[PDB]
Amino acid sequence: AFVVTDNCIKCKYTNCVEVCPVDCFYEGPNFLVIHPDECIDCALCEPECPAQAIFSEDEVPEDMQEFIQLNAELAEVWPNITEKKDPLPDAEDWDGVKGKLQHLER
Ligand code: SF4
Numbered sequence: 001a002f003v004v005t006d007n008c009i010k011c012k013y014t015n016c017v018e019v020c021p022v023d024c025f026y027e028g029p030n031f032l033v034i035h036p037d038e039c040i041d042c043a044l045c046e047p048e049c050p051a052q053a054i055f056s057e058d059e060v061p062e063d064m065q066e067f068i069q070l071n072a073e074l075a076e077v078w079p080n081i082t083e084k085k086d087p088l089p090d091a092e093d094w095d096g097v098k099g100k101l102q103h104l105e106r
């Protein structure tokens, strides 16, 4: 499985969803998650993220391990997103800011 981590929060560019061959991204207010059962590990989304927030689960940073689990449980509760959208208005001011998990919205 590929995993969306901290820097997607409050950016949510959604570039990643056009490349997914199996449409396994799910959408929250200010973040996206990958459903781990569905991902086929094609790695196509990882170069597409402006925020470089996607990682192979074996590559997730030591300080971001919580995201592996988070992606798995939020994917169960959020709706499927299959079309790109515009970025959050604010996206480019929040891109690169650390610790954005305290800003996550369910
Ligand atoms: S690795 Fe491939 S299948 Fe998995 S979320 Fe990315 S684009 Fe979709």
Ligand code: F3S
Pocket: 004, 007, 008, 009, 011, 012, 013, 014, 015, 016, 017, 031, 032, 048, 049, 050, 051, 052, 053, 054
């Ligand atoms: S910022 Fe988030 S919505 Fe996709 S393009 Fe990057 S994982």
